[PDB]
Amino acid sequence: IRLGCNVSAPSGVLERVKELMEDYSRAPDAKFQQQFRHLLSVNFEEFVAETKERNADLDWVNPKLDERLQLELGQRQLEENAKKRLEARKKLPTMKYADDIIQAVRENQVILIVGSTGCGKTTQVPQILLDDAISRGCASSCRIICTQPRRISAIAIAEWVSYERCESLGNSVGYQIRLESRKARERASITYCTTGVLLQQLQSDPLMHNLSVLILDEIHERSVETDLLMGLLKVILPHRPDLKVILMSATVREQDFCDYFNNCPMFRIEGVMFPVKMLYLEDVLSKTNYEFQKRMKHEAMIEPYLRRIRNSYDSRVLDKLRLPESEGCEDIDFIADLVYYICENEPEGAILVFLPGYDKISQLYNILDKPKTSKGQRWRDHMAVFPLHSLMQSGEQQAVFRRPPAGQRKVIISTIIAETSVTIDDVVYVINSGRTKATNYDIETNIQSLDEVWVTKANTQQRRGRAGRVRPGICYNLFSRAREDRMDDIPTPEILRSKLESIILSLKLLHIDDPYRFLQTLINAPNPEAIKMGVELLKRIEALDQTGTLTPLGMHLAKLPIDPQMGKMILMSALFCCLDPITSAAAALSFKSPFYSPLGKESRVDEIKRRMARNMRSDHLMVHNTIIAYRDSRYSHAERDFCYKNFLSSMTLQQLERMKNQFSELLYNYKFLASSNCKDAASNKNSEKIPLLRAIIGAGLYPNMAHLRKSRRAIHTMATDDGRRVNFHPSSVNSGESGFDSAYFVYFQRQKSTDLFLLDSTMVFPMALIIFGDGVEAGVTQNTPYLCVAKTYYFKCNRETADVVIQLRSNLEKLLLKKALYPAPIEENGYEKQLIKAIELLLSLDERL
DNA sequence: TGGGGATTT
């Protein structure tokens, strides 16, 4: 054991801490408490009873409305604004099956509709069931909810379906996504929503009494939410026999969903695209004849294949397939030569380049912009080259979606983002490198890694279709057919990669009290060892007790649209009067950073973040400083100027602002804040006390700690609490920095690409870790008294400061327990506020001088 | 000295 630095406090301070604690200890309406006992007392049978009576709105129909809408429907089908809209709808394949679909829903609780992009299942099925019920005189009984995986898709589909019905958005078609909703009318309506919206809504309506038809779309993508939703349908559907569910899928292991719902009926609806020809690595080199010059088990795969095609391809070509670097994107000048080829031959259309990541997109971009070869300079002024990456601005501007200038061809250099998320309509040529990146958690080593991996058969299929929108196109796949046969069918279902704390907690609100038993009933069951790991995290932050039962704090966390750790952090910030900065840290960690990463500018990006961090050595306070800056720029009408200067997405920021308020209102409704405003003065008296913020940030990120032992840009000898050597990720504001006032850091994410990096970090001080952490004991190991945290970091501390900090931690735990059970804001002049002031005072001993 | 991609009454 090595003894860290001294944390003994001055006698004068300890004497005041003792005084405040004794004031706290001389103190003697909770609707929330009875709800919490009522949840624990009922079994699932009773919960099912209770929820039926409480959500009865659909037991009521409006016959005067049923008839009124039935009349207006027939009438508007003979007008000449519609019935052009109907005749163009009738060219969509789905509409040929309308009547079989209507009947299939009538006779079966669950059906599946499987169809290719272009088939119109998403826009046409909901309209088919709605217009049916209206005509039959049931309009007011019909409320259709259609999920989508992506926010942008949910909206545009809504605007489109609303167009096909001659309505402004919000009469019969609407959308609801997080913090933005154009709600449709109450009854006889179709609502598009993100799958997550529906999940949070389950708490209030656990058995889906507030809808008549659930349509799950794009379930073949296996997002956690669709897979999670389907498992929940097996628990719900035996108790909702009048509910109708329609599953929807691409032709990507569609049979898995049909098998899952026990043998249910399955429609196959044909798609409407232009034919796209698939070429593979043998065919690409055959046309461009590019020359390469500058384990194997490349050979185990490639030679058996080269033998089967000896008579179909030239012998010089087949030799290049022996080169390990011919496939994938190892040689970028190979892809560059494939673009220059298309620019000459293969007449006009745009080129869509699929590259794995930021690094390789930069390489191809510089080559197409700064060519070293004659062929490249010939073409440079004739390409309009757009990089496409979630961290790059090009997606949030209208240039990459419009047609290129005259005499120029549009070339898009993209990640997998352009596969489904982003759509460019004039793409005719797709170059498919076959390589993407994936984050993989290894449960055995507690290491998350970011690796370059092969794409799956489903992916390649999706990138092909991207070329069949305007006219028949070509897709160039830079791998051999011997590779495709060795590629997987689909990507790993993402639920097997995801942290389970959120789900395990959210399940408790649905009275699904055994996460091991329930999660095993999913399409792909997550590793039970990963389930246990989640329960311990929840027991460690005291949201579950040792018996696994929900705790009062745990019920609060489960209701919040954020991970339980950052939910706790937000809660602490309400009790400690730093609501505004902390909810910036929580909102940013959950959603994303507001910062772009434009090509070439990586040095200037580092400088913008150095300045925004204000030497506070915390990535999270840095974002809050940015938001404080953003608000000021809205006050001065410099909003655009400010964002241009600091590489900021106004869209990201505005949505971070919206999340801060959602947290504030929830905390307000739960009786933890006096005001629903995250800026209110009362919620924020401590918001300028930087040592205090670091304490609450650490309470959120604990026990993810790091210790730095080296000084030199600067080199760092730094290791996490598990012992492994790490560095600050270069995108972090602590990379290469020297002269820290403390040697201990907290982090949200640790990830290995070239070394073990902390993607994000906040420097914290020992006394705050000790107060809000666990594994705290006082003793003697040298002839020195110590005070430790996590039983991992042992600090020099005299017996007077230890006995106080231990007694302090008790009263803190006693308070947190009471506030969760009996939520009420901390009054400014009460007993509770004194214990707070005691903690502020001990934490300020670390203030910068 | 480096950042696959969604999302939450």
Total Cβ atoms within 10 A of residue A22: 11
Q: A504 and A476 in one domain?
A: no
Cα distances (Å, whole numbers) of residue A8 to A333, A354, A379: 62, 58, 69
- Å between A749 CA and B3 C1'? 13
Nucleotide in closest CA–C1' contact with A563: B8
Residues A280 and A161 in one domain: no
Last residue of a domain, one of A502, A521, A550: A550
On strand B, nucleotides with any atom < 7 Å from a protein CB are: 1-9
Give bridge partners of residue A442 from the DSSP assignment.
A447
A485 shares its domain with A599: no
How far: A536 CA to B1 C1' (Å)?
A: 36
Residues A215, A318, single domain; the answer is no
Q: Which residue's CA lies closest to nucleotide B6 at its C1' atom?
A: A150
Å from the A640 CA to the B7 C1': 27
- Give, in Å, how far the C1' of B6 lies from the CA of A478: 26
Q: Which nucleotide C1' is nearest A566 CA?
A: B8
Q: Are residues A675 and A811 in the same domain?
A: yes
Shortest-distance nucleotide from A199 CA to C1': B8
Q: Are residues A649 and A504 in the same domain?
A: no
CB environment A770-792: b (16+ within 10 A), e (fewer): bbbbeebebeeeeeebbbbbeee
* Alpha carbon A359 to chain centroid, angstroms: 22
**Share of chain A residues as helix, strand and coil, in percent rounded to the nearest 5:** 45, 15, 40
Ramachandran angles phi, psi of A353, nearest 5°: -105, 120
Two tokens, residue A204: 């209030």
**What range defines the domain where residue A126 resides?**
29-272
Q: Distance (Å) from CA A546 to C1' B3?
A: 39
Residue A178 CB-density burial (10 A; 0-12 exposed, 13-18 middle, 19+ buried): middle
What lies within 8 Å, CB to CB, of A148 at 6+ separation is: A122, A154, A157, A192, A193, A194, A195, A217, A218
Number of domains in chain A: 4
Closest CA to the C1' of B9: that residue is A201
Resolution number, Å: 3.0
What are the backbone dihedrals phi and psi of residue A197, each rounded to the nearest 5 degrees, phi first? -50, -50
Are A108 and A125 contained in the same domain?
yes
- Do A220 and A340 share a structural domain? no
Same domain, A389 and A283: yes
Final residue of a domain: which of A526, A550, A574?
A550
Nearest to A218 by CA among A174, A266, A143, A154: A154
| Contacts by A304-309, CB closer than 8 A, 24 or more apart | A304/A482, A305/A480, A305/A481, A305/A482, A309/A282
What is the 3-class SS of A524-574, one letter each residue? CCCCHHHHHHHHHHHHHCCCECCCCCECHHHHHHHCCCCCHHHHHHHHHHH
Yes or no: say if A718 and A725 are a contact pair by the CB < 8 Å rule.
yes
Residue A227 C-alpha from the chain's centroid: 15
Q: Which nucleotide is nearest to A502 (CA to C1')?
A: B8
> Which of A762, A643, A656, A743 lies closest to A700, judged by CA?
A762
Q: Say yes or no: A116 and A147 in one domain.
A: yes
Reduced 3-state DSSP string for A292-350: CCCCCCCHHHHHHHHHHCCCCCCHHHHHHCCCCCCCCCCCHHHHHHHHHHHHHCCCCCE
- Angstrom distance (rounded) from CA A592 to CA A760: 12
- Say how many C-beta atoms besides its own lie within 10 A of residue A192's C-beta: 31
Final residue before a domain boundary, out of A221, A251, A272 = A272
Spanning CA of A520 to C1' of B8, the rounded length in angstroms is 23
Strand order in the sheet with A180-182: A180-182, A173-177, A189-194, A143-148, A213-216, A244-249, A110-115, A266-269
Pair (A460, A542) in one structural domain: no
User: Are A150 and A99 contained in the same domain?
Assistant: yes
A203 vs A558: CA distance, rounded Å: 9
* Protein CA A13 to sugar C1' B2 (Å): 45
